[PDB]
Structure formats: structure tokens, C-alpha cells
Amino acid sequence: DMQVYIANLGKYNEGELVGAWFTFPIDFEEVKEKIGLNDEYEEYAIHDYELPFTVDEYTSIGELNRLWEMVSELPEELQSELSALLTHFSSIEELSEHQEDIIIHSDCDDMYDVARYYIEETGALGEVPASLQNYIDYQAYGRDLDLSGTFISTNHGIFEIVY
Amino acid sequence: WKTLGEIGKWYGGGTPSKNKIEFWENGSIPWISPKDMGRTLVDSSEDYITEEAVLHSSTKLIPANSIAIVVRSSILDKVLPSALIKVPATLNQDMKAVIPHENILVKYIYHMIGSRGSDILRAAKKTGGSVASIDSKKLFSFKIPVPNINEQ
Amino acid sequence: ELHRQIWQIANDVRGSVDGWDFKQYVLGALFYRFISENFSSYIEATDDIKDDAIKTKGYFIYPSQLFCNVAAKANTNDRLNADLNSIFVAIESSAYGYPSEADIKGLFADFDTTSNRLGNTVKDKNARLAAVLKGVEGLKLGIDLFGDAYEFLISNYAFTPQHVSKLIAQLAMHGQTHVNKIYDPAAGSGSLLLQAKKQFDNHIIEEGFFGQEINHTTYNLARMNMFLHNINYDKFDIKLGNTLTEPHFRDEKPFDAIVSNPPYSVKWIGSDDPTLINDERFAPAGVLAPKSKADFAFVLHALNYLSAKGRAAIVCFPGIFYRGGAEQKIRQYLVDNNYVETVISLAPNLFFGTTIAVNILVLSKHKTDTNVQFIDASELFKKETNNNILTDAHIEQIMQVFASKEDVAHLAKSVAFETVVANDYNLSVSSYVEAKDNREIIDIAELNAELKTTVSKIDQLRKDIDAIV
Amino acid sequence: ELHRQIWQIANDVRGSVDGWDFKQYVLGALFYRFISENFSSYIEATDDIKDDAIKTKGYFIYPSQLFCNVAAKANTNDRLNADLNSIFVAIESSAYGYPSEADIKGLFADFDTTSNRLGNTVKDKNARLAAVLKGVEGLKLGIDLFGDAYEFLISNYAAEFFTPQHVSKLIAQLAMHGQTHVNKIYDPAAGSGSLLLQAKKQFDNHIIEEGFFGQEINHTTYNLARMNMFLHNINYDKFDIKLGNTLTEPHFRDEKPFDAIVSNPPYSVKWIGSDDPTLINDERFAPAGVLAPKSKADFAFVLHALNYLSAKGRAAIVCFPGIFYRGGAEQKIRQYLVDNNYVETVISLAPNLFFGTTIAVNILVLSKHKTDTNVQFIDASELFKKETNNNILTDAHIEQIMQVFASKEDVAHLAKSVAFETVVANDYNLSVSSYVEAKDNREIIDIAELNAELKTTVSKIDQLRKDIDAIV
Numbered sequence A: 001d002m003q004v005y006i007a008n009l010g011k012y013n014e015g016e017l018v019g020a021w022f023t024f025p026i027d028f029e030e031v032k033e034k035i036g037l038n039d040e041y042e043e044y045a046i047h048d049y050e051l052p053f054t055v056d057e058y059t060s061i062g063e064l065n066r067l068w069e070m071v072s073e074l075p076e077e078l079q080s081e082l083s084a085l086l087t088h089f090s091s092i093e094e095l096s097e098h099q100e101d102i103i104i105h106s107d108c109d110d111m112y113d114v115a116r117y118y119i120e121e122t123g124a125l126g127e128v129p130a131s132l133q134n135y136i137d138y139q140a141y142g143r144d145l146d147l148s149g150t151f152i153s154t155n156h157g158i159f160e161i162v163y
Numbered sequence B: 001w002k003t004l005g006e007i008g009k010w011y012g013g014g015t016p017s018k019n020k021i022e023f024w025e026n027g028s029i030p031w032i033s034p035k036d037m038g039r040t041l042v043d044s045s046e047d048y049i050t051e052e053a054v055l056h057s058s059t060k061l062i063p064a065n066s067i068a069i070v071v072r073s074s075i076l077d078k079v080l081p082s083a084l085i086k087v088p089a090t091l092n093q094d095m096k097a098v099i100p101h102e103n104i105l106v107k108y109i110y111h112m113i114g115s116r117g118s119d120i121l122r123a124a125k126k127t128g129g130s131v132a133s134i135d136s137k138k139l140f141s142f143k144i145p146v147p148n149i150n151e152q
Numbered sequence C: 001e002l003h004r005q006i007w008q009i010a011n012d013v014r015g016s017v018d019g020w021d022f023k024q025y026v027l028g029a030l031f032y033r034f035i036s037e038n039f040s041s042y043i044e045a046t047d048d049i050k051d052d053a054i055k056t057k058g059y060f061i062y063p064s065q066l067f068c069n070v071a072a073k074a075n076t077n078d079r080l081n082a083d084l085n086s087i088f089v090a091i092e093s094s095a096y097g098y099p100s101e102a103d104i105k106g107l108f109a110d111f112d113t114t115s116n117r118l119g120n121t122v123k124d125k126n127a128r129l130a131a132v133l134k135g136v137e138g139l140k141l142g143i144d145l146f147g148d149a150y151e152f153l154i155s156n157y158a159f160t161p162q163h164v165s166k167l168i169a170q171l172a173m174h175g176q177t178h179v180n181k182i183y184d185p186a187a188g189s190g191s192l193l194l195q196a197k198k199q200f201d202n203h204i205i206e207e208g209f210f211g212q213e214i215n216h217t218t219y220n221l222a223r224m225n226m227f228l229h230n231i232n233y234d235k236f237d238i239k240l241g242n243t244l245t246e247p248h249f250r251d252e253k254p255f256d257a258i259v260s261n262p263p264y265s266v267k268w269i270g271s272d273d274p275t276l277i278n279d280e281r282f283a284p285a286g287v288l289a290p291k292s293k294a295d296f297a298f299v300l301h302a303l304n305y306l307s308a309k310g311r312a313a314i315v316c317f318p319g320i321f322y323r324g325g326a327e328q329k330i331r332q333y334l335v336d337n338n339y340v341e342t343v344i345s346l347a348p349n350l351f352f353g354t355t356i357a358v359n360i361l362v363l364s365k366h367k368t369d370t371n372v373q374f375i376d377a378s379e380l381f382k383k384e385t386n387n388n389i390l391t392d393a394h395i396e397q398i399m400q401v402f403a404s405k406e407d408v409a410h411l412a413k414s415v416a417f418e419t420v421v422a423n424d425y426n427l428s429v430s431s432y433v434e435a436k437d438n439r440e441i442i443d444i445a446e447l448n449a450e451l452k453t454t455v456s457k458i459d460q461l462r463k464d465i466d467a468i469v
Numbered sequence D: 001e002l003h004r005q006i007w008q009i010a011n012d013v014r015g016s017v018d019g020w021d022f023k024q025y026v027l028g029a030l031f032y033r034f035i036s037e038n039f040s041s042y043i044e045a046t047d048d049i050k051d052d053a054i055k056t057k058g059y060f061i062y063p064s065q066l067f068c069n070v071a072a073k074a075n076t077n078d079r080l081n082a083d084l085n086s087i088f089v090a091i092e093s094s095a096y097g098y099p100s101e102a103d104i105k106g107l108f109a110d111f112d113t114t115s116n117r118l119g120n121t122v123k124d125k126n127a128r129l130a131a132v133l134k135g136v137e138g139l140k141l142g143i144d145l146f147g148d149a150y151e152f153l154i155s156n157y158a159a160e161f162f163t164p165q166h167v168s169k170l171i172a173q174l175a176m177h178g179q180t181h182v183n184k185i186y187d188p189a190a191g192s193g194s195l196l197l198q199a200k201k202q203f204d205n206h207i208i209e210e211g212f213f214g215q216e217i218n219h220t221t222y223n224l225a226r227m228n229m230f231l232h233n234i235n236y237d238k239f240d241i242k243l244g245n246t247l248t249e250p251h252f253r254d255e256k257p258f259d260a261i262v263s264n265p266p267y268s269v270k271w272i273g274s275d276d277p278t279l280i281n282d283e284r285f286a287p288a289g290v291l292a293p294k295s296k297a298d299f300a301f302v303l304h305a306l307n308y309l310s311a312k313g314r315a316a317i318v319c320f321p322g323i324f325y326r327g328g329a330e331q332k333i334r335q336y337l338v339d340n341n342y343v344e345t346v347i348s349l350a351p352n353l354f355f356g357t358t359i360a361v362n363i364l365v366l367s368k369h370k371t372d373t374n375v376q377f378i379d380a381s382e383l384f385k386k387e388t389n390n391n392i393l394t395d396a397h398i399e400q401i402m403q404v405f406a407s408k409e410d411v412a413h414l415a416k417s418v419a420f421e422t423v424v425a426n427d428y429n430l431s432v433s434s435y436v437e438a439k440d441n442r443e444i445i446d447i448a449e450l451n452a453e454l455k456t457t458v459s460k461i462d463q464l465r466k467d468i469d470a471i472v
Helices: A028-035 A061-073 A082-088 A092-097 A111-121 A138-148 B106-115 B117-123 C002-011 C019-043 C057-066 C091-097 C122-137 C147-154 C162-172 C191-200 C216-225 C295-304 C325-336 C394-403 C417-422 C442-466 D002-013 D022-042 D061-066 D125-137 D165-175 D195-200 D219-230 D299-307 D328-337 D398-406 D445-470
Strands: A003-006 A046-050 A102-105 A150-153 A158-161 B029-032 B047-049 B066-070 B095-098 C211-213 C238-240 C257-259 C311-316 C340-345 C359-364 D315-319 D345-348 D362-366
Touching (some): A061 A092, A082 A092, A082 A150, A082 A158, A102 A111, A111 A138, A111 A158, B106 B117, C002 C147, C019 C057, C019 C122, C019 C147, C019 C216, C147 C216, C162 C257, C162 C311, C162 C359, C162 C394, C211 C216, C216 C238, C295 C311, C295 C359, C325 C417, D022 D125, D165 D195, D165 D315, D165 D362, D195 D219, D299 D315, D299 D328, D299 D362, D345 D398
Parallel strands (some): C211 C238, C257 C311
Antiparallel strands (some): A003 A046, A102 A158, B029 B047, B066 B095, C311 C359
16 A cells, blocks of 8 residues: 655666655655665656555655655545546645545435435425425436536546536 | 734644544544534534544644634625634644634624624625635734724 | 318317327428429429429439439429329338439438338328328418428427527527528527527528537438428538537538537537547636536536637536635636626426426627626516416517626626635626515504404403303 | 446446346346356366367267257357458358257247347457457356346346335245145246246255246247346256236146245236126126226136135235225225135335335235134234345345235234224225224323423523613
């Protein structure tokens, strides 16, 4: 989980291929003793990674630990679905802005359940007469909430990006 | 003409995990819902969520002199519900809570909310035509008359 | 009578399945009858209610120069009617292919792709097509009220009712006789471009009513839609496919007025699977739209194809609300100049198979220099089912509001640009003026209070008397 | 948690089109997947997932008898799913003929109406086969209802009868008692017979005797319901389902006068008489006297159900609650049912406890095993009629319902047996007895009185001081 194959720019063609996997936190001198040096300093050749997100080929290791600390900052159900949540967003501090603004639904599993939750148990309208009990179009209600609300269908539930 | 929310650090709330059976059944902190709302002076709600649930609920602990407010599901159309919450109780992101600070009377703050309800509905009014409703923004951004502590 | 023939369509041809399946067959027979009547009328300019097989190529090139559909010598619907109720089916399948040969010039064809068919057996297919052709044949259609039947038949229960389209047209039109009009991105039907010709029967056509559309059956019915309204051959065509992927014509040209009706949150996977960051239409945005919407691609596409008198009247669900910093910088680039000028919100429903309030964005490369919103919530005449209709001169009231930047209470107005940047770039919280506010006088209430308390007290002591144990 | 994963796969394979054509994909792929499990596991004894001409159909005629196919020796899920740009087009309607026809023996035709050979394009078509059947090839375990996705692909509109499994469990545990007998089992008007699956694949080592001669109208529904049980090892060598309408064709009329049956009679089961053919003078509507009308012909089915009946074995049916006795048009019908105890017991239920009805039904249990007394042993609730995530094994009630159905357990706030002559004394209660004593409170005059008195006396001085403060 969350480990990188990063060495080295010396012998740029992935010659001097060393340094297998580095879980976080990752140090300059730790990897430097892992690899030696390439007679100078041109290292952390990002070429492979077990990460739940998208990383770049020249990201500095301090930025990597920064990203990891932002990952470890977030709750683990969100850490499981960072791939889905980052589709709406573009960065993690951006995600850390509205990290309070996520509605989690383990209880709701499709849009129908979202409609039934926000109508029935929320009580968004009050009266459910027995003459009117069946007669609440959860499908169209979910269509209209899908038009309005930013929704994300995931494995562990449905995540509503409300602002 | 004190602008809203500046009298005391009002809170947001915080939503737990309902699958945490230890953090959903036991304990005695009253878990407050907007269907528990609509009443007046609800010290304790119907739901009794766990006292250890604050490990995995991200809520706000409240004193005996807090007030509550909703931001979903009934306003954008009507006047806002409000209740005087009086125990240490907790609440989600479906609604919010206000504690005032020292420049005030919390009953005067409560009834300043309820009094200006016909206009503080209008204050941050739409902010989405969804079940999503009135923001925090102009719920923080309106000048109301707030007198001195001898006059509340 | 108009509604009598509408009633004839609403009963007679409706058989014997769901209308979306036999719709193609009905409209194909209707269109064939139209070409029959039109071609027979044209060849009289001497009694061809029955033809003659004397086809002259030096003369038959003149419809191919002129109407670009030589039907046949004697294969029209008037001439089908004698051989109606006879073997066989595919004479119409032939008489589709032959007039659609016509390669000279600018084909506007590949077109009558309806009847295939189902059908279960060949005699059943023959009897059904004979019934359809007789029922189309058994109508009382005079000569100009022909497209109205198409207007009704496309307005089955299942599409942008005519007053809303008229509102878009009047928003598209003031102080303007200027080639060209029009371009349409994501046209759907040509029903909204129908009113373009009702405007352009007045002076003249200017250029072709250019559309592009995705669904191929919708494409065919739209092409025959704007064919049926006596619209000339030369200019008036629609391209098939997505506009987000491959818009054309890119080169032709910066336009002068454009309308739309985009779909509801249809997705697109292109950000950035090609280099759409470095295109000509999404690059001044700086970011691309997410996959849960498409509308801003349409509006940047729109303002790309736009002149000094270029205006853009587009519709939206309220997904343009604020929706975050990328959507902010969309809105910001719009309010970077007077690109967007006015917005107009309506009231729910007003739309088929739909709920929500809709929004009407008006765009121009033209100074104001501020945003003057022109918005009501009522009225919005909501008496005929359901918010129907914005009646005749009810829309003219709204256009008069649109006319010169008015500031009417309980109605929207100008805002400052400094206000809306002081605002977080929103719509349409300003203004939303304060309906249904009432208050009363003390003395009536308190005298009723004291008298009912006295009634209550004497009833309470009377109840105490009634407390008999 | 595993069915959460399988559930998410069931959600995601629905992208991007509905299970009308994905019917063909799921059924054919899961069918040959079952073949490559079972039939190929017969010929493992370790060699091939990539199966080849190792079948020896001269000796592999035994699963062509027992599994009722040699399916595809050279056309496997591996031997058809590899590439792009091949020859040829046509692999999904007609010419897998040797498993589809398969006349020798026990053939059970319209068996392979999903995907044989045609066919639209070159390898858009056959590479659709390649890529999609390869993405389905690896859908592993993560097996009793391993087509839970198929139990949700048939439930795609169902999130009209599509077998609510709690009701199905209720019928199967209410098939009890007096059940270890022959035959096992008959079903008229079956439809999606997975109620038969939890009725017999549950009772597999218990008792397994005979075939399940269901009969439904919709032919695609018929075929999918036929192979549905066969998906998870319910044998279709001879244990089969017949096609047609149940009154025009009540085959088998000869085999036999049945003993134990179940059914769910749906709606859309009405028919016009009354009767124009010799069903005016048949074996079942001449005992009825008056005959089944154009609309309410649900009451014919119980007339059918007594037609296939014996005294020991009991029969559970259901009807939507448009039976009180439905006037003199059905009174004698009801009276025929109380001529003797042809009907034995009735049970009511709770709305909804179905897929969006929201009405109850009436369970009618019929045997000629008499006491004799009228039975009204019903219970509306509870019957926790919320969903299937609380009280999942028992409803805390199926043993209690079982005990009431066992012998005459007459518990209050629940209805009990009445006299056989009481139902002809009354005008045929179905069911008004008993419905005992909800929400009847009673309080103390002094407590309700003095408290009101005190709170008024609070309110009077509150009114007076309010008037004081009402001064500006």
C-alpha cells in the first residue's frame, strides 16, 4: 500500500536500476543509502507506484510525503475512494477545502435509496398518507437530484458533493 | 448592527458512521435530527447515541446553553425551526448549532433567530434549489440589532 | 378544420401499436404524399392528376437544379392510390432509392430509412402498409396547413412548447435583418427553428439554418421537419453527430444569432483524452467541464461562433448555479467582459417529462456594461396545464422588460458588476422580491381575544358545573 | 460483504444498456460457465480451462442425456473469445444446433433461444464476444444463488411477479406441514419459479421426487425461468416446465390428481367465458355452478386447485384481497368452498411485504383434511413488513405462524377458529374476525382534571401579566 519505485536518473535508461519500494515517510538519505549515488544528485526517477491517485514523474519526495500526510489526514473510507472523489476535484488541498462537504451513504446504494432516504426518513415533506404512501416517484426524484446535486456512485456507498 | 454569527463561535456539527454499532446504540448523548427538530426547548432528543461515539462522529460537544438551527429540507419555503438544546448533545451536518459569547443573551439570540425568521430565511435564501438549502455565508452576513447586556 | 384533422390523426392512424414505432411509417407516408403533391404542383408550371411516362432528361435536370427530387414519371401517391391494395410492399422501397440517387448537387439525402420492417408476415406487412397509406390518403388536406399536422404528431405524449420557442426567437430577434441566421448547436428538432422561418418569411432567408444533431432518427425527422415548411433546397441542412467531438463548420462562420436546447447532463469523455486543453474553444476557459455536464462546452462553442451582433440564446437547467471555482472561472470569463448580458429564469414546470425551473442565458459581444437580470417567478402564467402558456402579449410584456434595461419591482433589474463580484457570482438571488407579506391591526385581534376569553371562562365555569360525579 | 462486491458488479455490468439483450450475454455465458465447471470437471480426470476436442461425444453422450447437451467442443468460452479481425460474423442466434436441437434424448425444445449463430458484423460482433465474454470470464466467486446478479437482472425493473423471497420463504415454510410424501412437487401458474428453488433446493437432501410442471404465458419468461433453476444444479434432464395457458391447457390433466402444490396467481389472469367452449360443462366449473366472469377469473384458479388435489397433501395459494365473498356472483362459489371444508384455512398478511402493491394478500390453504371447524387463523402483523435486513432467518414469527397453522392456537390480538356454521350464519367473513383492541386508553378523572386545572391557573395569571405587558 502506497509505495514507489524511485531510482534513478543516473543512467537515464533505467540503468543503475535500484531501490525497490518505499513506503511513507520517505527520506532523501534513506533512499540515498538504498541506492548509493550516481556520482552526482539526479535521482527519484518516478517510474512505478502503488498509490490510490495520480502522481507525476518528477514529484519531489517532500511533496510525496506531503501527499501521503494529506492521505493519512483523510478518513479511510475516503482513502478507499480517492480515485472516484478526485474525478470531481483536481488536487487534495482542494479536496481538503470541502472535506466537510461530503455526504456519505453506506445506507443508500443506488439513486432510488437516496430518494427514499431524503423523502421518508428525512421527512422532507411530512405527511405520507396511506392513500399517498406508494405514490412518490423516487425515480424522478432521483433524476432531479442527479440534475441538481453532484453525486458519485462508489463501492462503499454514494457520496454527495454538496456545497 | 452586529453581523450574524459574530456574537459567538457557532458550529457545524458532524456526521457519524451508522454501521458503528457500538457508536450508534449505547451511551446517552442525545442525537439530534431535523425530525427531532421543529419542537422548542429540546434538551434531549429521542435518539440516544453513544458517549464514546465522539471517537468516530466528528461532532461538536455543546454546553447547557446552546441553540440549534437547520439548513435543510423545510426552509427555502417556510420559517426555520429552532429549539433550546440544554444537555451535552451532538448533531450531524444536516443542521448546525450556535453558541454565543458574552455579548449576548442566548435566549435573545434564540429569539433573534426566531424573530428575524421571516427575513433570515431570505438572508442566504436559495443557495441551491435542492434539498440543499441556506448556506452559512449570508447566514453569517446580516446586520441585526444586538443591544447591550443590560437590555436583552 | 384544424383540430378536426388533428383528431383524425389522434384516432385513425393510431393503430395498432405504440406510436413511436409506427410513427416512422406514418410520417414517411405523409412526407411521400407531400412530395407527390408538391412535385405534381410544380410540373404544372396540363392535367396531371394522372401522369405520362415522357421523362425528358434535359427537362428533368431542372428539378434537380431546382427541387432536387424528381419523384418519377408515375410513381406518386396519387398514382399509388390506383395500385393501392395490390402486390407488393417494396415499390416504395424502390421509390425511395431512385429519387435519392440525385447526386447533382448537394445531395441532402440518404434519408427515407424508415420501413424495413416489422411486421411478422408478408401479407400482414402488405395489409398494414395498405391501411397506413389509405389512412394518410383518406385525409382532407386541401395545401399549407400540412406542417401543422406534423407539429401535432411530433407533439405526442412521449417537446419545447411553441410559446417557449417563440420566446427564444424574440430573444434572438430585435433590430435585426442581417445575414446570417442561423446556427444551431444540438438542434434536436427543427421545431424551434420553425419560428425562424415565420420570422424569415417576412424579409428573406439569409443562410442555412445550420444544425448538428446526434440521434439518427431524430436527424432524419428534423431534416424532413424543416423540409416540410416550403423551405428551399439550397441552404437548409443539418450535420450528423456530436458537436463536442467534431463541430463543423468550424471555418464557416462567425454567426450572428444562435439558439439551443441542450440535453440534460449527458456525459462526454474527452478531458483530456485528446488534447482538448489545446483546442480553439476550450482554451480561454482554462479548464474543461467535468463529465457530469456538457452545457458549458455548448456555451463556449457558442461564443466561439459569434459576431459583433452575435447573440446566443441558450437554455439551462440550474446546474449553472455557482458550482465551484472552475465553474466560477467559467462565470468569471463570462463576466470578464459583457459576454453574458441578461439571464432569465422561469417557473416549474413548463416542460414535458420534466420538473425543474429553467434558465435562459443571453449572450453577446456587445457592451451594456453590467448584468441586467430580467427574471420573474410569476407570472409565468400557471393556469393552463401546467405553467402553460406564456400567452400572446404575456411574452411581449417580458420582451418589453427586455427592451431597455428596466428596473421593475417584484421583477429583476440591473445589478452592479462590483456587486456580483462582491457576490460569489450567483443567479438569481438578486433580486427575488418579497411576495405575500401581510400584517394586521392590534385592536381587532385583542378585542376578539378578550371576548373569546370571556366566552371561554363562562364555558369553563359551566364545564365545572358539568363536572358531575 | 461478499454479496456487496457481487452486488456492485451487478450494478456496474448494467452499464450501459438494460438486461433485455444482456439476458442473452448472462444466460449463455453463465450457462457455458456452468458447463466448463461441471461438465468439464467431469472430464478433468487438470488439463484445460482452454478446452479442446477431448469430449469424445460417443462417450460424452451421457451428459448429452443428463446435462441435455454436448454444448461446444470447439466453440467454448475460451475457443470463441480472443481477438479482433477474424472470419466470421455469426455466433448468437441460430447454429449452435447440436446443443440447441439435441434430440437424443429428453430434448426439451426452445432450450437455447439465447445465442447460437448470427450475427451482425465481422469482429465488432465477434470481438464484442471476445472482450465482453472475457470480462465476464473472470467474474469469479470473490454459489447457491451465484446468479444473484441474474436475480437482479430479472429484478432490474423490480429493483409483475418476480418472486419476493421472504414471501417465498413464507410459502415454503408454510408448505409445511404434513410433507414427506409423493409427489414432490406440482406447481400450476408458476412464472419465475425460484420460489420452487427455495422450495426444493432447500429440501434437496430432504426429499426430491418429481418435476415441477409450471405453466406461464410469456415465452421468454418461461425459458428464463426454466433455465433459472438449472443454473444452480436443479436438474432439467426430465424435471421440466410446460408452456401455455393454464385453463385452455391444464396439462397434465391425466398425470396426476396432485397432492401438494403451491402457486402465486398473478393479475392479468382474467379470461372470457362464460363458457363458450365445453368448459361450461367441464369437471370444475359445473361444480362451481356459476362460472368465472370476464375479469375476476382469479377464483377459477382455486377451482383449478381443487381439481388437482388430495385430502392429505395441502395446497397453499394466494389472492389479492378482492375476495370477501364478492357477492352472489361468487357467493355460491364461496359456498361451494364451504360446502365441505374444501378450503381449510386462511391467513392474512400485511401491506406491503411485496414489490409496491401496497396491499396485503390472502393465503388460502386447501386440503380435504378436516376437523371440522371454520378457520380464521390469520395475522396481519407482525410480520415485520419493512425489508429483508431485520429478522432475516426467522421473522420471529414463522415458527409462531407455523404453530398457529399446526393446531388451533387461539391467541388474542390474532384471530382464531370459528364455527363451520358461523360462516353461513354470518355473511362469509373474509376476514373481519378478529382485529382485537388497538389504542384504547383510559385515564383518571382527577389526574386529567387537576393537572388541567393547575395549568389553566398558570395560564390565567400568564394572560393577566401578558395584558400588563401588552401595554406599550
